[PDB]
DNA sequence: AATACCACTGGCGGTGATAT
DNA sequence: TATATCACCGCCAGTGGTAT
């Protein structure tokens, strides 16, 4: 698969970090948020690995259910959400 | 691969008042669809497939659209509205 | 366990030409 | 023109099976 940007692998790597943080409070595992999100454990383990590129959809429903802002992972994601609500207001 | 689906009705309906509006407006503002085209980056088959329903509007496409006819996104597809705003949820 | 690896495919979001 | 509607399909996110 073409790699990912070094930015996208970084996000990744602040996303997987909070996992490890906080799942044994949220009682997570990859398998729970594969079923939250209506995807299979090995399709979180691409996003949390780097392997597949986060969107701003699973990427704000995974702040959501990790209980942090988008922000503290992918700050370009956020910036993109808060453009598209310039749209909405 | 060749595979396309069909959009639902809440998709054609969107794709329908968006065309509308950009009707409404068009020389007012000065656009054709290779205007349009130029500035989301793709060709006059691009959008007339979101202004004709054969393709479906994402949320980014639906905001660079609202932006540029001047309308907000709800105007023509509240679903994506809400959508947008729910994101927003989680960055806010 | 819980997670990672790997080959694979559906459909997203287009393209250019041509017909109206 | 300006638009609509062909035929066409690259690409990669997500899969599901299996291994660690």
């Known amino acids: 698969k073409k790699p990912l940007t070094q930015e996208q692998l ?3 790597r ?3 970090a909070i996992y490890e943080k ?3 409070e949220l009682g997570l595992s990859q398998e729970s948020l594969a ?3 209506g995807m299979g454990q090995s399709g979180i383990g691409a996003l949390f690995n780097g392997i597949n590129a986060l969107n701003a959809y699973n990427a704000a429903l995974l702040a959501k259910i990790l209980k942090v802002s988008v922000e503290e992972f992918s700050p370009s994601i956020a910036r993109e959400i808060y453009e598209m609500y310039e749209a909405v207001s």
């Open 10 to 12: 970084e996000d990744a």
């Open 14 to 16: 602040r996303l997987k």
């Open 22 to 24: 906080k799942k044994n």
């Open 35 to 37: 079923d939250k999100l």
